[PDB]
């Protein structure tokens with residue numbers, strides 16, 4: 001079967017990465033197109049059980065995710081990676097892993113402002129951060145480096161459904 | 174798609190793990206079944222680039238391989254893993270990763286005597302070991318713990334084609 005591709009999200013916690021990724025996966029699976037949401041939180045229980053949450057370990061999580069994505073893509077899947085990916089350097093690294101493998105890679109920026117993400121707070125992570133229960137939380141006490149040249153910028157005026165269709169349009173362009 | 178399954182080979186260098194794995198992969202793909210050979214040598218260049226060859230790093234290589242295999246199986250592939258896997262603990266841990274995930278796992282022992290493996294010496298690794306250019310070579314220096322209860326035991330009186338079909342018969346059982 002033909003090589004797949006990778007959509008690499010980036011954005012603040014609660015910006016919509018997983019919501020968009022999951023809906024794109026469903027839309028594609030409804031058409032019989034193999035898609036797969038590769039979420040680091042899932043991998044940390046198994047593949048990445050050796051890692052903690054130091055800065056180096058967060059970078060290594062993303063490095064490994066980039067190689068798992070290239071593997072799944074080479075197996076024919078449309079891979080959707082909803083990681084925060086806060087530093088430019090590790091989005092560049094992840095792209096280079098894909099380019100070295102011959103696999104199409106798209107950087108998709110969920111550009112929702114902090115205030116809006118914090119009002120969403122779907123998992124209560126912002127409430128924990130503000131209470132001092134989580135530190136080095138991207139957007140609060142650790143930096144988010146905004147993508148300068150993303151392939152697609154998703155904005156909060158558009159619905160999850162609309163944004164999902166924009167990702168599919170990108171894939172098909 | 175229905176969940177896939179993993180075939181985990183084990184055996185000395187030159188016993189036939191890769192040859193059987195690769196032919197099973199071809200036979201299945203020619204029937205339209207989604208098979209994939211997951212080889213740690215390939216992964217060490219990317220995913221597992223951080224690992225060296227200490228005993229602990231060899232174990233961690235296999236631990237990570239077992240998770241990548243479960244992931245690809247959960248994505249619908251028939252996964253073939255041709256690793257030496259010399260310690261019983263390696264193979265038990267790998268099985269338990271699959272069982273915890275709900276994925277069928279088969280331990281296939283390529284039981285070819287050391288002398289016959291050395292007469293094959295397909296990549297010249299035995300010739301290097303005997304000249305003192307390689308060390309910690311399983312079956313010579315470093316122990317190989319023979320499977321006590323494999324799902325299938327492949328013997329060198331059969332052809333690679335015959336052995337491959339025995340693996341498929343196990344899968345279709």
Ligand SMILES: Nc1ncnc2c1ncn2[C@@H]1O[C@H](COP(=O)(O)OP(=O)(O)O)[C@@H](O)[C@H]1O
Nearest residue numbers: 013014015016017018019120122156158159160
């Ligand atoms: N485009 C959107 N329109 C409306 N609500 C959205 C939108 N994107 C996300 N949300 C809401 O915001 C929440 C946070 O989004 P989520 O996908 O969990 O973020 P992330 O995965 O980036 O942490 C979701 O629960 C969802 O209810």
Ligand SMILES: Nc1ncnc2c1ncn2[C@@H]1O[C@H](COP(=O)(O)OP(=O)(O)O)[C@@H](O)[C@H]1O
Nearest residue numbers: 185186187188189190191192293295331332333
């Ligand atoms: N059943 C067999 N009959 C004859 N030769 C075989 C058989 N199985 C393997 N071989 C030969 O031995 C070599 C085994 O190498 P390989 O499959 O790379 O072993 P491993 O992966 O176990 O190290 C192959 O080159 C192949 O030519």
